[PDB]
């Protein structure tokens, strides 16, 4: 689809982050207010069956 | 080739600025 | 507009709908005349008030006045919203634009200064006491002797004075017809010349005597983006302010007034001043080495409003310093005149006016009481140096008073400030504690608000770590509290602060359109060395050794002006020619190019744009010759040169020449050559980077030292022999020592900051604002791009077969002339005409003309009103029984040679010449007793085997053939056009053994294709060259196309 | 600035339009007159009026007669939609069912409208009247 920029900060810094697994759009889908930053129209996903 | 002049992104590998440039001789 | 009408009618329905009879017959005709002049009294600012007026109608009128006064004031802000984002519009519509916030911006103006004049001055007497004694302070320790009035004879007010006049003169150059009132000017100009003594006097006596002046006119220059002034002086006082302006500057020079941190200088261009501060940035003591926690700091701000906010007293007292009281008060004087604009008029008392002469002197001696407020007077003097032995720019007496203080490289540009910083870590803590003391920041806020650069990528731009931004905002506090904010004004919204520390691996800074980053060699990896353009390699003064790198990008407000220049060169009328807008384009392009030169091929967003721009430039005329979008079009109807008839276009961008487009043709004695000769070469590798043009002037002017240094002790003088060597190097050139008007400009000192300052007294732009030819020298060459341009599209004879040559019959090109800068239109269509009008470049649509056979692909009515002219009257026609008749006067002689009993001339119909579904036999040979007839062969063929097919009767057909750059060749028509004639149940033919002749006019070739009896064929090669040579109708038609196209020799 | 047709210096006829399925251009500037114009230096300028823009365009017996015939076909109290429902009821009689079509299209025909929901009294009144 069409869509519906940021500086550097104390909170972004990645040499404090920790790489170990890379982190997919799959991941911000399913947890959708884990991950995003702005999660402005987003649905809860039916979990299981 | 209809006409349509591209960019010159990527496009110089093996050129450099100063290249193929001259000097004029003093007139007279 | 027709809401606004709508408004009116109804305000004036509801004034005469309440009146009654007898007073709606009086009132129609008495509102209506003042009804308008109280809406021009407000547009003129002139208070409207009339007696003999009720007040509910005068009230009616006032809220008349005010609700179109705020319809007018959101129309014009909204105009100036559309063309400011690049929306096109009508041209009268940004030239009224211009006017109503002209109108707009003088009413802004005039109540400023009735609000400085009635709230008092802003300034207290006490900051005007610290100041007028710091500049008295800082006179008296540089021991600065007062310039002093010219008295009698200076012995250079000659010289002084012919400079002044040579500065007048240099605007009217450009174009030969002018008004009156700049007749009158020149005509002062030239009595100024004849006698020049009376002129000094006038002058002096001017000086001496006179304090009021006439007023001074303004005008706005339409930049897209933002207006600026242009004022307009009267040129008896004119010539006053410019030797005013001349010796100032000269003396000013002489007594070194100014220190040599104050920029623009006259040896040097803005980005040599870029390159020696990034120099002066590597060559400190140890700048680099953060392992104890040091920082570097880099400010760069500009005064805001520097030029509105002087006040005239305060100047003329910090003025009288340094120049005789009658000089200063002169000065003072000129600045409180009255402006006007066509219908208003206000005086000046607040700021000073920006346009004069000599207010170049004024910015610049006013803009160094700033620095006795910012720099302090203990740094400014280790800066400077003492007087009998001064400082070079960026330079300081030892290391200790370099590295003594925080504040260690300053630099001024007219009114931007660049200011670098270095920190240890127990200065940083305190000045971050006496900035968190009075402005604390409990949430940690100071993190938005912070300008940044987003043209860089996130992790080569400033990191925002908290301790560098509390540096950055103390720096900035610690800058703005030294100057009084009545005085002048510093903002952080117009700033930028880059830290390098231990977080920040970069710096970063703007200055003179450049973007600059510097990244160590010890903060990045290992030593690879892949060259790049645009990327400064940085390296110590002492070891030599490299230490860090400048990558340069062009900023944004450039490329934004460059586009709007694109956008105002197409608003071009349909009356512009082609090559106006060539022109301009050429013009902006150089003016691009040759200044930023080496950062050009580093941004790739300008490389998108020049390639976006030239390509509407192009279509801007494509769409100007036909109304419908070719599929392809040639590059070479741009790109050839004026000379050859072309347009001259620069090149910018990739475009390669198609193949089965550079090959040419000629036809002689033996037959039909054919003949075969790539990109089009760049603008950007034609001129010489910025780094190799410092090195080699560096070098040649040492070696020019030395010379100069052996040819003293010699006693010889230089000549051209010894400077050959070195002729067009270094900056300025070595080709300005070899001059007529050495001891002329000689004595012009402080000239480049003049030439930046004719922005406010011209009122056309100036590209090449940051130098003159005069001083530096000529700094780019261009005569290989047109050699290479020329060589690049297959030669002389490769171009000029699109360009219908070779239906002129002229011999040779070298004696050939245009008749005379700018060729019209319909000449450039009727000369590029075979190459426009080809099948591959309009698909499909093909139409042929009534009395002609000329295809027309497409529709042109600008061709065709050419085509009209030159075939008039039937002359097709007239061309092809002329052929015939000349044919049948040949084949009347000669009788007895080929056994011909009897020739005899067809009745050839009218329409026969022009139709092309079928033909008919012309001339018909009759055999005496019986021919032997080859098999059908080539004009030229030689190689003819004879059968035993005797026949009687023979046949001979005329074709004509008007054709393109693709389809000319005339062999293979003639034989196409053989093979279908004979092969065909629509031609008729009387004999089934003939021949067939083709003449092609827009080419003028000719060949032949049938069978062919004994004797015939060298008598009908012989018969067509004595016709092609000298048949009449076909010089009339040639003489018609070279009065045509208007090319002689 | 606008040029008229005496500056045009040897405008001729228009004789034919086609040849060789080849069109022919007239030889005059009329028609690019009557579409735009020219100005002193010779441009052309075109007008620009075409709204609806059409993609196609772009690129290419007496009435007592038919009374007496209809009483003909007619029992009393019935209509003559009725009659139709009744000879169609292959039918009984598709003959007198065409007939009876035909005499009321050609009733129909001659402007009396809504002939089929009409008696046959107020058919013989109207053959009376």
Same mark, same amino acid.
């Given at each position: ?18 790489? *170990? ?29 | ?28 | ?18 009146? +009654? ?95 400085? $004049? ?48 040579? *500065? ?55 930049? =897209? ?92 007292? $910090? ?45 610049? =001696? ?121 005085? !002048? ?22 200055? %003179? ?36 790198? %400048?990558?340069? *990008? ?21 009356? !512009? ?91 002689? /004695? ?115 791009? *047109? ?36 060729? +019209? ?81 067809? !009745? ?40 035993? !097919? ?38 008729? =033919? ?30 009908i090669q012989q018969a067509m060259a004595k016709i092609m040579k000298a048949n009449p109708a076909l010089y009339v038609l040639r003489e018609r196309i070279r009065k045509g196209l208007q090319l002689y020799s | 600035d ?26 005059? $500037? ?10 002193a230096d010779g441009n052309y300028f075109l007008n620009r009026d075409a709204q609806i823009r059409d993609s196609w365009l772009d690129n290419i017996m007496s009435a007592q007669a038919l009374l007496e015939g209809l ?33 009321? /299209? ?16 107020? $058919? ?6």
């Open positions: 689809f069409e869509p519906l920029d940021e500086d550097w900060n104390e909170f972004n810094d990645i040499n404090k982050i920790i790489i *170990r697994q890379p982190i997919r759009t799959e991941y911000k889908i399913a947890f959708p207010y884990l991950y995003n930053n702005l999660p402005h129209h987003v649905h809860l996903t039916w979990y299981h069956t | 080739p209809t006409g349509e002049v591209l960019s010159l992104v990527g496009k110089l590998e093996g050129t450099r600025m100063g290249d193929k440039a001259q000097r004029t001789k003093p007139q007279m | 507009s027709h809401f606004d009408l709508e408004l009116r009618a109804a305000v004036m329905h509801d004034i005469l709908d309440m009146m +009654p009879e007898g007073i709606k017959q009086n009132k129609a005709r008495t509102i209506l005349q003042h009804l308008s002049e109280a809406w021009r009294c407000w547009k003129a600012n002139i208070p409207w008030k009339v007696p003999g007026l009720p007040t509910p109608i005068e009230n009616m009128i006032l809220r008349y006045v005010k609700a179109k006064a705020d319809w007018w004031t959101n129309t014009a802000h909204y105009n100036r919203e559309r063309i400011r984002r690049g929306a096109t519009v009508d041209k009268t519509v940004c030239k009224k634009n211009l006017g109503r916030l002209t109108r707009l911006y003088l009413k802004a103006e005039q109540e400023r200064q009735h609000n400085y $004049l009635k709230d008092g001055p802003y300034i207290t007497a006490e900051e005007a006491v610290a100041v007028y004694t710091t500049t008295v302070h800082w006179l008296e320790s540089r021991r600065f002797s007062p310039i002093p009035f010219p008295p009698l004879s200076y012995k250079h007010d000659t010289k002084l004075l012919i400079l002044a006049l040579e *500065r007048l003169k240099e605007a009217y150059s450009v174009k030969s017809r002018l008004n009156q009132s700049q007749r009158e000017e020149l005509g002062l100009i030239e009595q100024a010349y004849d006698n020049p003594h009376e002129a000094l006097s006038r002058i002096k006596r001017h000086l001496l005597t006179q304090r009021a002046f006439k007023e001074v006119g303004i005008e706005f220059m339409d930049l =897209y983006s933002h207006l600026v002034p242009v004022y307009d002086v009267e040129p008896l006082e004119k010539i006053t302010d410019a030797y005013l302006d001349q010796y100032l500057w000269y003396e000013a020079d002489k007594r070194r007034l100014f220190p040599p941190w104050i920029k623009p200088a006259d040896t040097e261009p803005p980005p040599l001043l870029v390159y020696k501060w990034c120099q002066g940035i590597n060559n400190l003591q140890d700048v680099w080495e953060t392992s104890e926690g040091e920082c570097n700091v880099m400010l760069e701000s500009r005064f805001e409003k520097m030029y509105e906010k002087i006040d005239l007293t305060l100047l003329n007292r $910090l003025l009288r310093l340094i120049v005789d009281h009658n000089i200063a008060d002169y000065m003072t004087a000129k600045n409180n005149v009255v402006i006007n604009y066509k219908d208003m008029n206000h005086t000046n008392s607040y700021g000073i006016i920006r346009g004069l002469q000599f207010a170049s002197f004024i910015v610049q =001696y006013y803009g160094l009481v700033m620095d006795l407020l910012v720099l302090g007077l203990h740094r400014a003097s280790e800066m400077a140096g003492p007087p009998q032995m001064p400082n070079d720019f960026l330079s300081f007496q030892d290391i200790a008073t370099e590295a003594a203080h925080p504040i260690r490289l300053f630099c001024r540009y007219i009114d931007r400030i660049h200011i670098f910083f270095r920190f240890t870590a127990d200065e940083a803590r305190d000045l971050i504690q006496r900035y968190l003391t009075e402005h604390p920041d409990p949430n940690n806020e100071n993190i938005v608000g912070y300008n940044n650069k987003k043209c860089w990528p996130r992790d080569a731009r400033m990191r925002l770590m908290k301790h560098d931004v509390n540096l950055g905002r103390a720096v900035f506090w610690d800058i703005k509290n030294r100057l009084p904010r009545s005085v !002048t004004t510093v903002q952080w919204e117009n700033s930028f602060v880059s830290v390098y520390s231990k977080d920040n691996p970069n710096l970063l800074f703007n200055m %003179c359109g450049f973007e600059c980053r510097i990244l160590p060699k010890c903060r990045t990896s290992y030593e690879e060395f892949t060259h790049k353009d645009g990327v400064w390699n940085l390296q110590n003064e002492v070891t030599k050794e490299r230490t860090a790198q %400048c990558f340069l *990008r062009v900023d944004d407000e450039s490329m934004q002006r460059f586009h709007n220049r694109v956008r105002q060169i197409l608003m071009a009328s349909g009356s !512009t020619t082609f090559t106006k807008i060539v022109n301009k384009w050429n013009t902006a392009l150089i003016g691009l190019m040759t200044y930023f030169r080496e950062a050009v091929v580093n941004t790739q967003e300008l490389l998108d744009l020049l390639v976006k721009c030239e390509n509407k430039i192009q279509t801007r005329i494509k769409i100007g010759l036909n109304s419908k979008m070719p599929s392809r079009f040639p590059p070479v109807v741009f790109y050839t040169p004026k000379e050859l008839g072309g347009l001259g276009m620069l090149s910018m961008g990739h475009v390669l020449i198609p193949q089965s487009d550079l090959r040419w043709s000629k036809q002689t /004695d033996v037959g039909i050559t054919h003949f075969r000769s790539q990109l089009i070469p760049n603008l950007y590798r034609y001129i010489q980077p910025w780094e190799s043009e410092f090195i080699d002037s560096q070098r040649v002017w040492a070696e020019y030292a030395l010379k100069r240094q052996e040819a003293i002790a010699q006693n010889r003088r230089l000549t051209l022999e010894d400077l050959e060597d070195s002729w067009d190097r270094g900056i300025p050139r070595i080709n300005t020592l070899f001059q007529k008007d050495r001891h002329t400009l000689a004595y012009d000192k402080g000239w480049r900051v003049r030439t930046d300052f004719k922005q406010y007294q011209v009122l056309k732009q100036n590209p090449f604002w940051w130098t003159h030819q005069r001083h530096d020298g000529k700094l780019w060459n261009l005569n290989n791009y *047109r050699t290479d341009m020329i060589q690049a599209l297959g030669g002389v004879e490769g171009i000029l077969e699109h360009t219908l040559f070779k239906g002129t019959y002229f011999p040779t090109w070298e004696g050939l002339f245009w008749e005379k800068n700018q060729i +019209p239109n319909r000449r450039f269509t009727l000369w590029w005409s075979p190459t426009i009008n080809r099948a591959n470049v309009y698909v499909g649509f093909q139409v042929q003309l009534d009395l002609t056979g000329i295809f027309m692909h497409g529709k042109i009515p600008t061709l065709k009103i050419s085509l009209i002219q030159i075939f008039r009257a039937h002359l097709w026609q007239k061309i092809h029984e002329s052929i015939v008749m000349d044919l049948c006067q040949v084949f009347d002689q000669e009788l007895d040679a080929l056994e011909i009993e009897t020739v005899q001339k067809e !009745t050839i119909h009218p329409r026969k010449s022009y139709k092309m579904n079928s033909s008919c036999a012309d001339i018909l040979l009759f055999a005496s007793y019986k021919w032997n007839v080859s098999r059908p062969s080539l004009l030229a063929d030689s190689k003819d085997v004879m059968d035993s !097919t005797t026949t009687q009767k023979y046949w001979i057909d005329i074709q004509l053939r008007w054709g393109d750059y693709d389809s000319h060749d005339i062999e293979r028509y003639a034989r196409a056009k053989f093979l279908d004639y004979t092969t065909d149940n629509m031609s008729i =033919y009387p004999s089934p053994t003939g021949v067939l002749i083709a003449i092609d006019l827009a080419y003028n070739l000719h060949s032949a294709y049938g069978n062919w009896f004994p004797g015939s064929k060298p008598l | 606008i040029l008229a047709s005496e500056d045009v210096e040897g405008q001729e006829a228009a004789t034919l339009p086609s040849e060789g399925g080849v069109r022919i251009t007239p030889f005059n $500037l009329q028609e690019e007159m009557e579409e735009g114009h020219f100005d009483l003909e076909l007619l029992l009393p109290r019935e209509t003559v939609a009725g009659a139709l429902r009744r000879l169609g009821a292959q039918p009984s009689s598709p003959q007198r069912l065409d007939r009876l079509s035909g005499l009321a /299209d050609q009733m129909v025909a001659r402007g009396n409208l809504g002939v089929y929901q009409e008696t046959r009294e107020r $058919l013989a009144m109207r053959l009376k009247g």
